[PDB]
């Protein structure tokens with residue numbers, strides 16, 4: 001029984017210090033996906049220890065170890081939306097705490113909720129978007145389509161189910177008020193990961209950055225939590241070209257699988273999910289320019305030490321422009337054949 005021994009070690013051996021994981025672990029240059037998957041549960045505990053959440057909130061270590069394993073095991077294995085995505089999004093949250101002094105802008109309990117929301121925010125993803133849920137009349141649409149953010153509601157609900165599994169409630173000693181505040185935060189933060197939501201609140205984020213962040217304004221807290229969540233969710237784009245290239249591979253595999261299922265059902269997939277129509281370079285450029293860059297630009301406006309993130313993201317965009325031409329076949333293909341043209 002793989003999990004029982006894994007739990008034993010994670011509990012009885014002790015929490016390893018962050019620096020023993022990698023000398024560079026707490027820097028924006030680090031690529032969390034470099035960490036072997038078998039070490040990631042220990043890494044989560046190490047990050048929580050280093051942020052001092054274990055002691056500040058008196059988390060029971062047996063309960064925590066079970067919780068982390070249950071969360072990990074609650075991800076499936078589609079090419080992009082898997083445990084390694086949630087681990088890396090969680091790691092970026094840790095980066096922001098380390099590098100940007102969040103405690104000057106947010107309450108402790110808010111930062112904690114953000115991190116625990118990053119762990120849980122794609123739980124049980126099936127490699128399909130919200131609209132596929134509605135078009136295929138899945139069980140999840142039956143439960144949630146009338147409210148919208150179908151997958152995100154499912155993710156949150158899976159988080160709650162893990163919490164109400166016996167031995168997994170890391171918050172069960174909180175006051176009733178703090179318990180309710182944590183669950184409410186997790187709902188808002190995980191819901192914020194639907195990009196439709198982000199697009200709706202984009203102007204309100206702009207406004208906040210114009211007038212300047214007001215720590216006494218409760219709506220500013222909520223808006224910032226959303227922006228930070230989105231920043232963690234897309235943080236793959238703040239690393240190096242190699243990571244970006246690889247990540248695009250995983251996303252388009254996942255997207256194109258969806259499109260293949262849609263074609264089988266008689267539907268026309270959106271362009272970016274149709275392997276016969278998607279022109280990856282112009283799609284990435286558009287995504288980078290019209291969604292990702294403005295996010296990290298806002299983050300830079302609010303936190304001057306976040307400049308390097310924006311610049312990476314702009315640099316990754318230009319790189320796509322630069323390699324775009326390689327998607328045109330010049331000469332013959334490697335095999336020296338034009339057989340591919342009767343296909």
Ligand SMILES: Cc1cc([C@@H]2CN(C(=O)c3ccc(F)c(Br)c3)CC(F)(F)C2)n2ncnc2n1
Nearest residue numbers: 233234235236237247248251272283284286287
């Ligand atoms: C880190 C990262 C994450 C995502 C996607 C963004 N998402 C989209 O809907 C989407 C919207 C407009 C687009 F033009 C494209 Br393309 C995709 C949702 C998601 F699938 F969860 C994650 N991408 N996509 C392309 N490079 C990415 N890098």
Ligand SMILES: [Mg+2]
Nearest residue numbers: 121122193194
């Ligand atoms: Mg998601």
Ligand SMILES: [Zn+2]
Nearest residue numbers: 121122193233
């Ligand atoms: Zn995500």
